[PDB]
PDB file of C-alpha atoms and ligand atoms in Angstrom:
ATOM      1  CA  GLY A   1      42.873  26.345  29.345  1.00  0.00           C
ATOM      2  CA  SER A   2      42.160  26.788  25.597  1.00  0.00           C
ATOM      3  CA  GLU A   3      38.672  27.728  24.816  1.00  0.00           C
ATOM      4  CA  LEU A   4      37.877  24.428  23.226  1.00  0.00           C
ATOM      5  CA  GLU A   5      38.344  23.114  26.458  1.00  0.00           C
ATOM      6  CA  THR A   6      35.699  25.255  28.158  1.00  0.00           C
ATOM      7  CA  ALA A   7      33.486  24.300  24.995  1.00  0.00           C
ATOM      8  CA  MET A   8      33.331  20.597  25.673  1.00  0.00           C
ATOM      9  CA  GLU A   9      32.508  21.551  29.297  1.00  0.00           C
ATOM     10  CA  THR A  10      29.864  23.948  27.881  1.00  0.00           C
ATOM     11  CA  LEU A  11      28.260  21.506  26.158  1.00  0.00           C
ATOM     12  CA  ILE A  12      27.760  19.016  28.971  1.00  0.00           C
ATOM     13  CA  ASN A  13      27.001  21.853  31.136  1.00  0.00           C
ATOM     14  CA  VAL A  14      23.799  22.983  29.234  1.00  0.00           C
ATOM     15  CA  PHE A  15      22.868  19.525  28.427  1.00  0.00           C
ATOM     16  CA  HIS A  16      23.035  18.635  32.056  1.00  0.00           C
ATOM     17  CA  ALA A  17      20.681  21.190  32.953  1.00  0.00           C
ATOM     18  CA  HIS A  18      18.327  21.038  30.148  1.00  0.00           C
ATOM     19  CA  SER A  19      17.976  16.859  29.873  1.00  0.00           C
ATOM     20  CA  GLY A  20      17.158  17.294  33.687  1.00  0.00           C
ATOM     21  CA  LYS A  21      13.853  19.118  32.906  1.00  0.00           C
ATOM     22  CA  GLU A  22      12.430  15.743  32.108  1.00  0.00           C
ATOM     23  CA  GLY A  23      13.159  12.141  32.169  1.00  0.00           C
ATOM     24  CA  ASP A  24      16.749  10.865  32.522  1.00  0.00           C
ATOM     25  CA  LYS A  25      19.332  13.701  32.283  1.00  0.00           C
ATOM     26  CA  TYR A  26      21.631  11.365  30.237  1.00  0.00           C
ATOM     27  CA  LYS A  27      18.677  10.513  27.794  1.00  0.00           C
ATOM     28  CA  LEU A  28      17.467  13.284  25.650  1.00  0.00           C
ATOM     29  CA  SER A  29      13.937  13.197  24.713  1.00  0.00           C
ATOM     30  CA  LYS A  30      12.229  14.670  21.436  1.00  0.00           C
ATOM     31  CA  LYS A  31      10.737  17.447  23.624  1.00  0.00           C
ATOM     32  CA  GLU A  32      14.023  18.260  25.294  1.00  0.00           C
ATOM     33  CA  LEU A  33      15.817  18.134  21.700  1.00  0.00           C
ATOM     34  CA  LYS A  34      12.761  20.578  20.055  1.00  0.00           C
ATOM     35  CA  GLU A  35      13.457  22.965  23.027  1.00  0.00           C
ATOM     36  CA  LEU A  36      17.336  22.423  22.783  1.00  0.00           C
ATOM     37  CA  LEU A  37      17.622  23.190  19.195  1.00  0.00           C
ATOM     38  CA  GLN A  38      14.911  25.598  19.299  1.00  0.00           C
ATOM     39  CA  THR A  39      15.714  27.633  22.274  1.00  0.00           C
ATOM     40  CA  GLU A  40      19.709  27.765  21.851  1.00  0.00           C
ATOM     41  CA  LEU A  41      19.399  27.869  18.049  1.00  0.00           C
ATOM     42  CA  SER A  42      16.214  29.446  17.464  1.00  0.00           C
ATOM     43  CA  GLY A  43      17.790  31.730  14.736  1.00  0.00           C
ATOM     44  CA  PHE A  44      20.239  29.055  12.892  1.00  0.00           C
ATOM     45  CA  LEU A  45      17.467  26.092  13.453  1.00  0.00           C
ATOM     46  CA  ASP A  46      14.450  28.116  13.597  1.00  0.00           C
ATOM     47  CA  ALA A  47      12.387  24.905  13.665  1.00  0.00           C
ATOM     48  CA  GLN A  48       9.328  26.875  13.884  1.00  0.00           C
ATOM     49  CA  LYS A  49       9.460  27.631  10.266  1.00  0.00           C
ATOM     50  CA  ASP A  50       8.913  23.896   9.756  1.00  0.00           C
ATOM     51  CA  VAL A  51       7.865  22.043  12.907  1.00  0.00           C
ATOM     52  CA  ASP A  52       7.249  18.899  10.842  1.00  0.00           C
ATOM     53  CA  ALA A  53      11.535  19.112  10.223  1.00  0.00           C
ATOM     54  CA  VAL A  54      11.835  18.037  13.929  1.00  0.00           C
ATOM     55  CA  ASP A  55      10.754  14.455  13.058  1.00  0.00           C
ATOM     56  CA  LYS A  56      13.307  14.460  10.411  1.00  0.00           C
ATOM     57  CA  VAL A  57      15.834  15.841  12.588  1.00  0.00           C
ATOM     58  CA  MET A  58      15.139  12.935  14.999  1.00  0.00           C
ATOM     59  CA  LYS A  59      15.127  10.482  12.698  1.00  0.00           C
ATOM     60  CA  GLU A  60      18.494  11.026  11.924  1.00  0.00           C
ATOM     61  CA  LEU A  61      19.724  10.840  15.387  1.00  0.00           C
ATOM     62  CA  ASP A  62      18.105   7.449  16.197  1.00  0.00           C
ATOM     63  CA  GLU A  63      20.671   5.430  14.870  1.00  0.00           C
ATOM     64  CA  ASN A  64      19.111   2.602  17.022  1.00  0.00           C
ATOM     65  CA  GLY A  65      15.984   3.048  15.537  1.00  0.00           C
ATOM     66  CA  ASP A  66      14.368   3.121  19.004  1.00  0.00           C
ATOM     67  CA  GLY A  67      12.429   6.238  18.572  1.00  0.00           C
ATOM     68  CA  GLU A  68      14.187   8.161  21.457  1.00  0.00           C
ATOM     69  CA  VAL A  69      17.328   9.987  20.997  1.00  0.00           C
ATOM     70  CA  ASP A  70      20.847   9.739  23.241  1.00  0.00           C
ATOM     71  CA  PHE A  71      23.344  12.198  23.811  1.00  0.00           C
ATOM     72  CA  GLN A  72      25.850  10.553  21.792  1.00  0.00           C
ATOM     73  CA  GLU A  73      23.521  10.451  18.881  1.00  0.00           C
ATOM     74  CA  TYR A  74      22.978  14.082  19.559  1.00  0.00           C
ATOM     75  CA  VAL A  75      26.765  15.294  19.727  1.00  0.00           C
ATOM     76  CA  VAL A  76      27.420  13.954  16.548  1.00  0.00           C
ATOM     77  CA  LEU A  77      24.972  15.982  14.839  1.00  0.00           C
ATOM     78  CA  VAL A  78      25.433  19.170  16.715  1.00  0.00           C
ATOM     79  CA  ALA A  79      28.950  19.301  14.843  1.00  0.00           C
ATOM     80  CA  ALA A  80      27.410  19.188  11.617  1.00  0.00           C
ATOM     81  CA  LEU A  81      24.814  21.994  12.880  1.00  0.00           C
ATOM     82  CA  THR A  82      27.258  24.527  13.565  1.00  0.00           C
ATOM     83  CA  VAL A  83      29.137  24.233  10.588  1.00  0.00           C
ATOM     84  CA  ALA A  84      25.983  24.267   8.824  1.00  0.00           C
ATOM     85  CA  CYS A  85      25.094  27.656  10.847  1.00  0.00           C
ATOM     86  CA  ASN A  86      28.134  29.183   8.883  1.00  0.00           C
ATOM     87  CA  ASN A  87      25.853  29.008   5.624  1.00  0.00           C
ATOM     88  CA  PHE A  88      23.348  31.461   7.392  1.00  0.00           C
ATOM     89  CA  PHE A  89      26.355  33.608   7.928  1.00  0.00           C
ATOM     90  CA  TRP A  90      27.339  33.588   4.182  1.00  0.00           C
ATOM     91  CA  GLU A  91      24.032  34.640   3.242  1.00  0.00           C
ATOM     92  CA  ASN A  92      24.931  37.925   4.487  1.00  0.00           C
ATOM     93  CA  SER A  93      27.308  38.294   1.751  1.00  0.00           C
TER      94      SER A  93
ATOM     95  CA  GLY B   1      21.889  33.743  24.193  1.00  0.00           C
ATOM     96  CA  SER B   2      22.109  30.223  25.523  1.00  0.00           C
ATOM     97  CA  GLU B   3      25.685  28.844  26.258  1.00  0.00           C
ATOM     98  CA  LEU B   4      25.583  26.647  23.167  1.00  0.00           C
ATOM     99  CA  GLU B   5      25.099  29.339  21.250  1.00  0.00           C
ATOM    100  CA  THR B   6      28.426  30.767  22.388  1.00  0.00           C
ATOM    101  CA  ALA B   7      30.403  27.146  21.980  1.00  0.00           C
ATOM    102  CA  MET B   8      29.520  26.961  18.230  1.00  0.00           C
ATOM    103  CA  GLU B   9      31.036  30.396  17.982  1.00  0.00           C
ATOM    104  CA  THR B  10      33.821  29.082  19.949  1.00  0.00           C
ATOM    105  CA  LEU B  11      34.538  26.262  17.842  1.00  0.00           C
ATOM    106  CA  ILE B  12      34.723  28.502  14.817  1.00  0.00           C
ATOM    107  CA  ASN B  13      36.742  31.019  16.472  1.00  0.00           C
ATOM    108  CA  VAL B  14      39.191  28.595  17.771  1.00  0.00           C
ATOM    109  CA  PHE B  15      39.560  27.072  14.410  1.00  0.00           C
ATOM    110  CA  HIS B  16      39.952  30.192  12.608  1.00  0.00           C
ATOM    111  CA  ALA B  17      43.070  30.979  14.706  1.00  0.00           C
ATOM    112  CA  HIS B  18      44.710  27.656  14.867  1.00  0.00           C
ATOM    113  CA  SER B  19      44.301  26.849  11.162  1.00  0.00           C
ATOM    114  CA  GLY B  20      45.639  30.106   9.957  1.00  0.00           C
ATOM    115  CA  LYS B  21      49.188  29.691  11.327  1.00  0.00           C
ATOM    116  CA  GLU B  22      49.616  26.875   8.354  1.00  0.00           C
ATOM    117  CA  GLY B  23      47.972  26.607   5.141  1.00  0.00           C
ATOM    118  CA  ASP B  24      44.334  27.015   4.327  1.00  0.00           C
ATOM    119  CA  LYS B  25      42.156  28.323   7.447  1.00  0.00           C
ATOM    120  CA  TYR B  26      39.457  26.654   6.256  1.00  0.00           C
ATOM    121  CA  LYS B  27      41.712  23.322   5.534  1.00  0.00           C
ATOM    122  CA  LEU B  28      43.257  21.801   8.494  1.00  0.00           C
ATOM    123  CA  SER B  29      46.580  19.978   8.434  1.00  0.00           C
ATOM    124  CA  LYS B  30      47.894  17.112  10.306  1.00  0.00           C
ATOM    125  CA  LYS B  31      50.271  19.247  12.149  1.00  0.00           C
ATOM    126  CA  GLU B  32      47.584  21.649  13.049  1.00  0.00           C
ATOM    127  CA  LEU B  33      45.371  18.831  14.176  1.00  0.00           C
ATOM    128  CA  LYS B  34      48.125  17.534  16.295  1.00  0.00           C
ATOM    129  CA  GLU B  35      48.552  20.874  17.800  1.00  0.00           C
ATOM    130  CA  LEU B  36      45.018  21.653  18.461  1.00  0.00           C
ATOM    131  CA  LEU B  37      44.400  18.204  20.049  1.00  0.00           C
ATOM    132  CA  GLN B  38      47.462  18.224  21.811  1.00  0.00           C
ATOM    133  CA  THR B  39      47.412  21.615  23.084  1.00  0.00           C
ATOM    134  CA  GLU B  40      43.659  22.045  23.639  1.00  0.00           C
ATOM    135  CA  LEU B  41      43.072  18.492  25.083  1.00  0.00           C
ATOM    136  CA  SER B  42      46.695  18.211  26.377  1.00  0.00           C
ATOM    137  CA  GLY B  43      45.272  15.898  28.899  1.00  0.00           C
ATOM    138  CA  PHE B  44      42.150  13.984  27.699  1.00  0.00           C
ATOM    139  CA  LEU B  45      43.503  13.364  24.342  1.00  0.00           C
ATOM    140  CA  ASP B  46      47.405  13.188  25.639  1.00  0.00           C
ATOM    141  CA  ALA B  47      48.650  12.224  22.121  1.00  0.00           C
ATOM    142  CA  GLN B  48      51.903  12.303  23.772  1.00  0.00           C
ATOM    143  CA  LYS B  49      51.523   9.092  25.451  1.00  0.00           C
ATOM    144  CA  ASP B  50      50.876   7.529  21.785  1.00  0.00           C
ATOM    145  CA  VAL B  51      52.354   9.740  18.839  1.00  0.00           C
ATOM    146  CA  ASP B  52      51.535   6.590  16.621  1.00  0.00           C
ATOM    147  CA  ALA B  53      48.037   7.155  17.446  1.00  0.00           C
ATOM    148  CA  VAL B  54      47.847  10.674  15.789  1.00  0.00           C
ATOM    149  CA  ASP B  55      47.816   8.847  12.537  1.00  0.00           C
ATOM    150  CA  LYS B  56      45.048   6.628  13.442  1.00  0.00           C
ATOM    151  CA  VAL B  57      43.217   9.395  14.668  1.00  0.00           C
ATOM    152  CA  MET B  58      43.582  11.373  11.204  1.00  0.00           C
ATOM    153  CA  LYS B  59      42.906   8.176   8.843  1.00  0.00           C
ATOM    154  CA  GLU B  60      39.416   7.988  10.614  1.00  0.00           C
ATOM    155  CA  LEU B  61      38.842  12.177   9.686  1.00  0.00           C
ATOM    156  CA  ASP B  62      39.823  11.562   6.320  1.00  0.00           C
ATOM    157  CA  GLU B  63      36.529  10.078   4.656  1.00  0.00           C
ATOM    158  CA  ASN B  64      37.664  11.150   1.325  1.00  0.00           C
ATOM    159  CA  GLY B  65      40.774   9.187   1.489  1.00  0.00           C
ATOM    160  CA  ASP B  66      42.650  12.216   0.644  1.00  0.00           C
ATOM    161  CA  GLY B  67      45.157  11.758   3.628  1.00  0.00           C
ATOM    162  CA  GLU B  68      44.430  15.706   4.484  1.00  0.00           C
ATOM    163  CA  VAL B  69      41.549  16.403   7.177  1.00  0.00           C
ATOM    164  CA  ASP B  70      38.674  19.213   6.642  1.00  0.00           C
ATOM    165  CA  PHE B  71      37.194  21.030   9.265  1.00  0.00           C
ATOM    166  CA  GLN B  72      34.117  19.283   8.403  1.00  0.00           C
ATOM    167  CA  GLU B  73      35.654  15.985   9.162  1.00  0.00           C
ATOM    168  CA  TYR B  74      37.102  17.118  12.491  1.00  0.00           C
ATOM    169  CA  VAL B  75      33.949  18.825  14.076  1.00  0.00           C
ATOM    170  CA  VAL B  76      31.952  15.395  13.771  1.00  0.00           C
ATOM    171  CA  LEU B  77      35.057  13.433  15.452  1.00  0.00           C
ATOM    172  CA  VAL B  78      35.390  16.196  18.130  1.00  0.00           C
ATOM    173  CA  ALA B  79      31.694  15.830  19.218  1.00  0.00           C
ATOM    174  CA  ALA B  80      32.590  12.074  19.936  1.00  0.00           C
ATOM    175  CA  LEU B  81      35.851  12.929  21.914  1.00  0.00           C
ATOM    176  CA  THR B  82      34.132  15.306  24.014  1.00  0.00           C
ATOM    177  CA  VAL B  83      31.969  12.676  25.397  1.00  0.00           C
ATOM    178  CA  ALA B  84      34.974  10.263  25.354  1.00  0.00           C
ATOM    179  CA  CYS B  85      36.596  12.771  27.855  1.00  0.00           C
ATOM    180  CA  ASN B  86      33.860  12.232  30.348  1.00  0.00           C
ATOM    181  CA  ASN B  87      35.221   8.644  30.534  1.00  0.00           C
ATOM    182  CA  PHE B  88      38.368  10.007  32.284  1.00  0.00           C
ATOM    183  CA  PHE B  89      36.050  11.792  34.861  1.00  0.00           C
ATOM    184  CA  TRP B  90      34.566   8.253  35.275  1.00  0.00           C
ATOM    185  CA  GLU B  91      38.025   7.461  36.510  1.00  0.00           C
ATOM    186  CA  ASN B  92      37.547   9.838  39.617  1.00  0.00           C
ATOM    187  CA  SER B  93      35.121   7.309  40.812  1.00  0.00           C
TER     188      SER B  93
HETATM  189 CA1   CA C   1      16.174  14.305  29.488  1.00  0.00          CA
HETATM  190 CA1   CA C   2      18.346   6.018  19.655  1.00  0.00          CA
HETATM  191 CA1   CA C   3      45.018  25.517   8.146  1.00  0.00          CA
HETATM  192 CA1   CA C   4      39.528  14.320   3.615  1.00  0.00          CA
END
């Protein structure tokens, strides 16, 4: 009943909807990835400042070297990004 | 404004409250870890079945080898656990 329980569900709930837009829901594509980070984290991840950076980000996600990113790869990185988001807050003071 | 934005905040919001119970909010202790996984994921992580498993889990979290777990270490693992939670759902059918 904790908020975290809701959050794990939240990640999947957003993933299911967004991934469905293209290809397999279970598989995340670079476009979808760009759109998820860009739209959900337009501020913290504001990729617009550096479009090239998207490729750099995907490269880290593709452990396989396949060139395509899996949700499993995505979840590991998002955990790091949320923490990184705090850095932005630190800028405030 | 996406749900994910709320979720990143949710993780920190729960972390701030729980970690504060003991030691440094910024530092996560084994007790607090046990309580967070056990209470927030009493079902999916039901550590009660295997108390010994808690040590196994912390060991993976401590990259440093310090024996103490940091939130940074915790966030990486939680991302994996949420996905693992789905496995439980799979059992349904
Ligand atoms: Ca997809
Ligand atoms: Ca891959
Ligand atoms: Ca603490
Ligand atoms: Ca450590």
